[PDB]
Amino acid sequence: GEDWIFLVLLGLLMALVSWVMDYAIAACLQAQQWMSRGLNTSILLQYLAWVTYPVVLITFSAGFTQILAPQAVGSGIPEMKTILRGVVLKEYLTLKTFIAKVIGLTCALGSGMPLGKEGPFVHIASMCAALLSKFLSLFGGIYENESRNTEMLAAACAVGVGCCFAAPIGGVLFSIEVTSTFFAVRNYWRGFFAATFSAFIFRVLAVWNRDEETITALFKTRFRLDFPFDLQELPAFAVIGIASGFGGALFVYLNRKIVQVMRKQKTINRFLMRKRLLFPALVTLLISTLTFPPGFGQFMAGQLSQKETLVTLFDNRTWVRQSTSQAWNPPRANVFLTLVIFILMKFWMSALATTIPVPCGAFMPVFVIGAAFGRLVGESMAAWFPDGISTYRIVPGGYAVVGAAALAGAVTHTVSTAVIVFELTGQIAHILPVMIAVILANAVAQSLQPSLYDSIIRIKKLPYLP
Amino acid sequence: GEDWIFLVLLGLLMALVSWVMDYAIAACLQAQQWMSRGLNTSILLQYLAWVTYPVVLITFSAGFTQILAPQAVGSGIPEMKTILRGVVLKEYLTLKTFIAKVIGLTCALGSGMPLGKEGPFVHIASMCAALLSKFLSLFGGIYENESRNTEMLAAACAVGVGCCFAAPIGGVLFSIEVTSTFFAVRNYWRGFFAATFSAFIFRVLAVWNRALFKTRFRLDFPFDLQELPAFAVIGIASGFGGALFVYLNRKIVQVMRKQKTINRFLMRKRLLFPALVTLLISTLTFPPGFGQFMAGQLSQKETLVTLFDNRTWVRQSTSQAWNPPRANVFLTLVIFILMKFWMSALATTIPVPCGAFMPVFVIGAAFGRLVGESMAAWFPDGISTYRIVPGGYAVVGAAALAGAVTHTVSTAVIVFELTGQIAHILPVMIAVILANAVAQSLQPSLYDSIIRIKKLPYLP
Ligand SMILES: O=C(O)c1cccnc1Nc1c(Cl)ccc(OCc2ccccc2)c1Cl
Ligand SMILES: O=C(O)c1cccnc1Nc1c(Cl)ccc(OCc2ccccc2)c1Cl
Ligand SMILES: [Cl-]
Ligand SMILES: [Cl-]
């Protein structure tokens, strides 16, 4: 069957495209730190370099995107949910939109702005499906139909999320929850088949490389295997779920409220529609200025990238017991204050930064806010019970995994975040805690606000089935 | 909200029912061992006790089923697939059918017979859902909607498979793949909710009155990239074997229909078929006789716990059962595989409440362990500081053959929750995908094959 040649080529090309983008994003983030370490000659020369380099990468991302393909701003998922519902869009799967996203996303993330890649990876995979089916001319000529287009793009959304999180089953399951309302079991088998082939290519690349480029071997946790938690502390993992449900409902509300204000302020909007590159540059300058380590970044671990922040929050050691915890315990504050200020600052910075005219997603931004809030509860438990909830003392890094999944699930309207965190953290010992928090987060988030992508659909005035 | 009160109570009742049944099955299997070791002075009395005890339990299970509810016979997935397509079955969700499935399955599994409970748990959970939805005051001709009822029967399949395997996510994904053609996202959220409340009650009971198959392999370099062809061969060979099982089951049912004089002779004296097949299996399972050459002294749980063992056996514990003084590990695994294959295809046809997942999962574990131990014999120092892990190949082969028989891929998710580890994920998915690609090209699912055999409303 020709469809099983299509799905191995769709799985091969998205693994290469993901690995090439990740190599280019890392080189951009490393150059910021090298430049800072070089320019320790004066605080003003170090500050000038810290604010300038992000603003140059974001200004180039917005300008280059506007020149090739103005359709390439924002996330794929809220359009793909309408393309699979049978609605044609103007230029969306064309090679100019591919070139615009692969270059424009690499500059948006390499700036060090608080931005995700999931929605963009769903669009880039769908463009690989479309452009593949024409480069080898499988489409049009031989009994081809809109049904076969929708069936090949649905497996591409599954490969898109699967390559993003390095989570081959949880990516297939997440794609179904966000793009669809009924899914064929035959389409879940085709997603699972192509996702498994993308996973195989990542192991070959990682074996040919020095390491997994996904730090700590794809965020692999190293907690104890025996008595990792007690039934006496299930009431704490439940309060993470509920609070993450309210938190994710506020994030989606605030992001829509920001866009509605920029549309309602018509005089400023007319000025900015002439001055098209001004708004993305000013937002980048503000965020980089507050993240400046010698000024205010010391109270937010501002010197860390988004990988480095999450690798630190998932450590097996306890911080409140009297390697990178040093970024959370500066000479002027304790770890609890630094967690509370990081949570409060990253919340408004991430609801704002995702509105700017660049290719960007939003899942890693809410995943790290959730991990920090989970770690705040975990260290607070380890401080209240210093030697046992007897003999088995508390493990705060396992509370961070539960908070990550619970806030990401509330914002997304999803339960496959539970499956992703097992494949990602490399362990299953916290399964019951994760599933209680994730279902409590969804039970109250779905009672308060739509999903993030359903807000983006209604903001963009795409055709909506509630 | 009435839907969450229902999905809490359904998660509580199926977990309580599952626990009381596993207590009663373990008691019946302990009685067999006590009675056997109490007779170690007389081989003849020990053989008489060994074949009589299971023949009595099966004869009672068949007889008690045929008195209360003949519709309670066999695996309940094919009828639930048919009822979820909107076909009506007469008395298939009633209290007589429940009592017959609960007691009949307890007696059928409390015996050495190669039977499972996956299909019976899908039926028992659907009876709990019917009884709860009949009990609650929102029952009546204004609100007994077929949509409401079909929505809860779809969640009850997920609770039943979740309680069966003790795999709360994998049990929802398997229920979708076997009972449905469209994965509705709103019902996959209900399956996850109700499977969570059962997993909580299971741990509360595991404190106050005390998955079970948890493994302890390396976290560092458990397999090399040089080994993926051996996990692929397991998937390919597991595709042909999983197709052969569905064919062999159907041929056995067609032959007992075909031969008219034998058919009518047995149908007049209905208990002679389940009694005489139990007697032949028990006679071959008798340990001082032939049974030592197929580990006949272990139960199904005790067998599977030895197959997932973290040591290599071919280096040259209950796992000694695979190496009697007269035969090695390999010969005992090959004899086990071939004898269990025909015994399980046959035993799942007999007139008692029985499923078929554990019998195929165990043959896959022995076939996987056989390939793992072959690799560990061929590569004594690694494919170095790192040696091969044969118990990981047993997890791969067990996941692949259960997927090829059932036409599912979510046996990959089940195996990580059972084993408590996710390090073998790439090997498992490659073996499962090869096993389904090879099997779907040859035969229907075991459950579709039963729909054809039973002349139910098929839909390819
Ligand atoms: O931060 C860095 O140093 C970095 C370096 C190289 C490449 N990417 C980096 N970061 C990054 C960002 Cl900004 C957004 C998304 C993301 O996707 C995977 C993922 C994994 C788990 C949860 C949620 C998303 C990654 Cl890995
Ligand atoms: O054998 C015993 O000593 C035993 C004692 C008490 C209760 N059950 C026992 N066995 C058993 C049987 Cl017969 C059928 C099904 C099953 O579980 C579902 C499952 C679990 C893992 C893999 C694949 C299926 C179990 Cl655990
Ligand atoms: Cl992301
Ligand atoms: Cl079973």
Residue numbers in the entry:
A (entry chain B): 88 to 409, 419 to 485, 490 to 566
B (entry chain A): 88 to 297, 304 to 409, 419 to 485, 490 to 566
What does the paper say about this structure?
CLC-2 is a voltage-gated chloride channel that contributes to electrical excitability and ion homeostasis in many different tissues. The TM region of CLC-2 displays a typical CLC family symmetric homodimeric structure, with each subunit containing an independent Cl− pathway.
Intriguingly, the lack of density for the hairpin peptide in the AK-42-bound structure suggests that hairpin and AK-42 binding may be mutually exclusive.
